[PDB]
Each structure stands twice: as C-alpha cells, then as structure tokens.
Amino acid sequence: EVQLVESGGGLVQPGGSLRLSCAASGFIFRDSWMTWVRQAPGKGPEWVADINQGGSHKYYVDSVKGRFTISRDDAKNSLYLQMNSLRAEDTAVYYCARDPEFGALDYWGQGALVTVSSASTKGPSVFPLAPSSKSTSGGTAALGCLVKDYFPEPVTVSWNSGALTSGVHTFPAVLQSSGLYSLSSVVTVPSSSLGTQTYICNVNHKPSNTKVDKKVEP
C-alpha cells in the first residue's frame, strides 16, 4: 500500500520559516519524480516545486523562487520543503505527491496546513454538548463537543479514540468576530444507549500541543 505522510504544518509569522516533511512507503521512492503542490483556502490546487530522480533538476514556481528549497533523502524515503521569508499568500494546505509523468499526480499525501499570520497561538476550550430531552429527536439523542476559541486551524476531533464513527458530523470551523475559530462535533446515537455507553471526544490542536479527552454525560 502506498502512503505519503506529511508533517510539520503550523503557524509562522510573515518573514518566518517553516519546514515540511513527506515520508513515503509502498513504492520505490528513489525512482519517483516528487512534487509539492498547495491549495489556498476555498481555491483550487497550484504548483509549488518538484524534484526529479537524482535531485539534479529542481523546479520552483515564480512566486517561491529563492525563498523555498525542495530536497529529498532517498535512503529515508523522505521529501522535504524548506520555506523561508514566508508571506500571507503562502497560507495553504500543502500536498506532497508522486509525479509519474507530466503532472498526472497519482499518489498524494494527506495535506499539511501552513498558516502565515502574526496573531497568537491560542489553544481551544472544550465544553460538552450534553444529551437531554432537548437533544432528543424521536428515538435518537444527539450529543457533542464544543471546541471554542482556538487559533490557528486545524483541530481534529474523534470519538472514543476512533471506534465511534457512525452518525458523526464534525462541522467546519467558523471565524468568530474575535478572530478566533470555533467548531462543534456531534454524534447521533440511540437514546436507549444513554447511561449505558460512554462517549468521549478526543480533541487535538497541535499548534498549541493541546490533546483533550472530554467525557460527555447526560
């Protein structure tokens, strides 16, 4: 199975530097032309940089020429992107990808969000959305977690460490008037299972190294 696992996303102020990494597996990395593309919020993909099999040819789009550096370590099956002198326009989800021929990218990483912004890092507050007669609809109950006042994106939410996925909706983050983000994650369960089954939301906000396990009770 082919995997490309990226890391290093996060927040840096304008003029700063950040380093992304892309760890491959499942194919012969040394024999692959490799690529970085990015997607700005609400837009489509755009090229950033690529590197051929020996590392002898490095291409950069005009906007990042002289500020970004692409490199590879074949013995570690790793692709790197060193970003310097970052601008707000560089804010995007960055994807590493394998290029078999002429931009027809066939294997993609999971994405890494780079935010370029001067605002402070703020870890979220997690509040329960408790099930009650008012979160009942027929034979079903809704419960959730309110992940409030964090910066920057992203936060991830899972339920019972990933074992609970049916009926789950984690909403996209909302920009609040304060400039901080907020989101809710909710799950619909049979109301008969309340008081029997435990429900825990796992909130992760890496930029502030916040990992929370909040038990949501009726």
């Binding site: 489509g44 993909p45 994807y95 990218l105 309110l146 909403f171 909302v174």
Partner: protein
C-alpha cells in the same frame, strides 16, 4: 502561465444520469513528443485530490469506466456516464504540457436527491462554559436536503440579530445530505436575564416551521 478555464462552475446532477465538464486551455496542450498532457482530478469533501483521467483519456487504475476524457488542442471534456453518490465534490483539470503546470479553478458536482427534513436538536450552554463568562447556545439540523434552511433564534420571544453564526457541512458522500449548526453567543449575564431560548427552523421538508425551546 497557461490559463485553464472550466465550465460549468456548478453542475447539479441526479444519481444515474450523465454529467459533462468542459476545460479550455489558453494554449495547445500537444507536447513536442506528440502526446497531450491533460488530467482530471476529483476532490471529495475533506480529502486530498485523487486522479481520475490523464493523457486526455487514460483512466487511473482505481477509477471505473464511468469516467471518460476526450478532446484535443485546447478543448477538453470529462464525462460521467452514470453519476454515483460518491462522485460529489470538486473536479479540476490540469495541463502538464507546459511549465508551470496549471490547474483549472474547479467545477462543483452537486447531487440532487429527494427531500429530507432535518432532525433538530438544541443544547443549552454547559456549566463549565458559564463559569468563564460567556454563553453559547447551539442549534443543530441533521441530515437534510436541500441545503436551503432558515434558522431563527428567539429569546423570550424576541427575535435575535447579529449574535449567531452558522456552519454547514459539505454534501455527504453516502446519503447526499447536509448538516448545519447555528450558535447563539451571549455574555453570561445577558443569558441569565432571560428564560425561554428557542430555535425556529424553516425547511422544505418540515410540515411547518419547527421550534425547539428550553427554559433556563
């Protein structure tokens, strides 16, 4: 740089019916080796892009023959013979003939389906939040279609304005529905001044506007 222009910008389709997406380049995409390098990608909500078509008409190994690519020179078409629910999302063309490689702006494929009224849930603020000084009241609408819905907040039967925000999920990859959250934000002191908090929902699926209330 080569300009890739896609049309339509949004395409409403019902399951089982065909769909067509066009893509135009500002230059010919014939490379000096005689091949034309045009690919199509699909981005499902909250996921990485995924390759469908390349070299104008080659289908990716994990992509069924329902998808087909066609065209020449600067005019290209992606066709889905029968649309499935998992086809929802944004589609991009990409030329690789010239450097830099350029993507289209995207075409949103939207699934039309039968009306589904929302289930409505309301949550009072938690006591942990109240200890901090602010009150959030959350109204939830789950698994509805179409997307258009009206959510009004009433505090002691007074209509609210300017103190609530909405978040809407993208159309689901399995059942093709939406979910929506509306959040009323108030100081603790303002929250403790009133008694009845109501979320009124207007949707085509409901038998009439629905209200979910609680007494603080």
């Amino acid at each position: 740089d080569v300009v890739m222009t896609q049309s339509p910008l949004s395409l409403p389709v019902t399951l089982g019916q065909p769909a067509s997406i066009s893509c135009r380049s500002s230059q010919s995409l014939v490379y000096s080796d005689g091949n034309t390098y045009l690919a199509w990608f699909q981005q499902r909500p909250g996921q990485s892009p995924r390759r469908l078509i390349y070299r104008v008409s080659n289908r990716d190994s994990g992509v069924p023959d329902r998808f087909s690519g066609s065209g020449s020179g600067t005019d290209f078409t992606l066709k889905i013979s029968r649309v499935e629910a998992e086809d929802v999302g944004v589609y991009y063309c990409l030329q690789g003939t010239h450097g830099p490689h350029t993507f289209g702006q995207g075409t949103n494929l939207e699934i039309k389906r039968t009306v589904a009224a929302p289930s409505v849930f309301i949550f009072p603020p938690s006591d942990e939040q109240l200890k901090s000084g602010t009150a959030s009241v959350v109204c939830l609408l789950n698994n509805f279609y179409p997307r258009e819905a009206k959510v009004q907040w009433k505090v002691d039967n007074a209509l609210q304005s300017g103190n609530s925000q909405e978040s809407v999920t993208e159309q689901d990859s399995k059942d093709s529905t939406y979910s929506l959250s509306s959040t009323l934000t108030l100081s603790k002191a303002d929250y403790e001044k009133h008694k009845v908090y109501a979320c009124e929902v207007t949707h085509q699926g409901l038998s009439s506007p629905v209200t979910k209330s609680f007494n603080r």
